Write a protein that binds this ligand. Structure first.
Ligand code: R1M
Ligand code: R1M
Ligand code: CL
Ligand code: CL
Ligand code: CL
Ligand code: NA
Ligand code: NA
Lengths: 315, 306
């Protein structure tokens, strides 16, 4: 799973997530990266929401679905202390959730940002119960992406412990992006490549913003980079299902309009997040969630780059 | 869309929903009836949940801005005044910020006897519900209408009632709905009839000792099989003339969930969803399958076709 959250120079936020899902899964299994409120969430500031918040999640299994994690984080982040809100959500709402009481371990992660105009004050955080997680982030002003591998401290237990880190940025035509290349087992061998792909992803989003793109276009451009890495379980290199085939989930949410696009169990499309983004764009009753054969056909009919030799129609 | 909610003799609740979705929809479009927390919800009483609650919803496609409806209703039903809670939810999510839909809900708490409060509410012109207790022995069916002069999508109708249950029989309670939409006085007899049969199937399951999820599944199987409901047989055809069904089910005791989306070729979609939930209690087993792979899984598990 990969994800990104973006805030533009006006405080508009967007979030997206993309995954290949559980390795060896049964054909047609759709997980958190496609599901409304579970994989990502983005909500501009409003009447009862004093912060603009964007959330994207990581992990596989049904752990993030059962808890509707992304929307839950977004709601917790309306409290004053963002760090305490996210940490308590990860511990109470995610690890010790009643929805996951029958589990020996709960594995996942999140990236979040929240902004409010005071200039723009952007707080951003990441948190995970996996051994490690690779993040990247960048402001349009600072001009250089920063990447970091977040690890559970010695003595922590994967699936029982929370690591949480973050920071603050003050912010023209700029903005801020936080991305992640996945949460899982530590792989020191692949660490530079995950850091490298997080760096390029941030730069793509910041480039889009600086050129005037919408927050959703910026976050989509970052996810396209993250999918394209053969090392991430999304897009190219997604886990193979039980039949040895690729089936991708992806979704995206716009904080300004609250619109949402998503694809599930999609084969034959190089960048699943692009279909989800196209649905959100066209949808501004248009569909927001397309799966399987029909999703592929819809993407092809909308000019989204395909690959017919990687598309399966069992039927 | 069709739905049902069940409470067993011990206060365990279950909820399910099944739909053919938007007529002429693009192939592969999956709607609320397949989505966790949106189409149905069931949650036994717990630490922060003083009531056992079960919710099933009905909609015509027009998605709500940021709602996750069934789970939102369930949380609203933790307030003292259930009627006011549901009404305020319907008002904010549908009328305030027209959107056409409906809900059925129940909430129970142990007093040993069981107090069951049940409600239905809609912004559609009309909605047909049925309900039955294991004790009363006779199903009740009812057609709810918007008050004369009201405007669909701008008014909320809400009705309900209260039932008490002997807490140690093999009894329970079921509420179903055959859909929320335009009033059709001609088809009213069949809609009340299918809700009656659906309730009795659920009550029969309960009295034989079945789980609440098996009972709610048996009621949705009857509702699906009616050609007048937009679910199972007689579902709206998509843009290419094909049937694609969404369905889901949730267990209040275990909080497990099963769901299918864009499912074709299977007579009773809710049976696949129930089967996924059933198998997920016996690699993390799947809870949500769509399209061809869902059909293949269902066929491989003995669930009937066509
Ligand atoms: C079950 C989790 S998953 O979505 O299958 N997935 C497997 C691929 N993995 C890649 C990954 C793992 C660790 C990691 O952290 C590190 F800091 F870089 F080592 C990472 F960035 C990516 C993600 C989990
Ligand atoms: C949202 C549109 S839909 O395509 O999901 N669907 C289309 C079919 N329609 C059938 C129906 C209509 C009215 C009903 O109630 C009663 F007034 F009693 F007749 C009833 F039970 C069933 C329900 C909505
Ligand atoms: Cl599976
Ligand atoms: Cl459509
Ligand atoms: Cl399919
Ligand atoms: Na990849
Ligand atoms: Na039907």
């Amino acid at each position: 799973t990969v994800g990104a959250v973006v805030v533009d120079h006006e405080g508009n936020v967007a979030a997206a997530v993309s995954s290949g899902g559980l390795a060896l899964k049964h054909p047609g299994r759709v997980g958190q990266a496609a599901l409304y409120g579970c994989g990502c969430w983005a909500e501009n500031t409003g009447a009862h929401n004093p912060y603009s918040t964007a959330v994207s999640t990581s992990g596989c299994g049904e752990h993030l679905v059962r808890t509707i994690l992304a929307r839950e984080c977004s709601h917790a982040l309306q409290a004053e202390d963002a760090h305490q809100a996210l940490l308590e959500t990860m511990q109470n709402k995610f690890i010790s959730s009643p929805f996951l009481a029958s589990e020996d371990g709960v594995l996942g992660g999140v990236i979040v940002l929240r902004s409010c105009r005071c200039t723009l004050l952007v707080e951003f955080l990441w948190s995970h119960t996996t051994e490690s997680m690779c993040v990247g982030y960048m402001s349009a002003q600072d001009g250089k992406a920063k990447t970091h591998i977040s690890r559970l401290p010695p003595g922590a237990v994967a699936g029982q412990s929370v690591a949480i880190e973050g920071g603050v940025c003050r912010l023209g035509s700029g903005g801020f992006v936080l991305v992640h290349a996945g949460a899982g087992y530590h792989s020191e061998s692949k660490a530079k490549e995950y850091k490298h792909v997080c760096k390029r992803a941030c730069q793509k989003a910041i480039e889009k913003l600086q050129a005037g793109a919408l927050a959703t276009d910026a976050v989509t451009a970052a996810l396209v980079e993250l999918e394209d890495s053969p090392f991430t379980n999304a897009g190219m290199g997604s886990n193979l299902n039980l039949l040895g085939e690729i089936e991708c989930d992806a979704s995206i949410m716009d904080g300004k309009s609250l619109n949402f696009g998503a694809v599930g169990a999609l084969s034959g499309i190089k960048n699943p997040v692009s279909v989800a983004n196209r649905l959100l764009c066209e949808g501004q009753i248009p569909p927001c969630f397309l799966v399987g054969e029909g999703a592929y056909r819809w993407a092809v009919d909308h000019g989204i780059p395909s690959c017919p030799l990687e598309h399966h129609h069992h039927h």
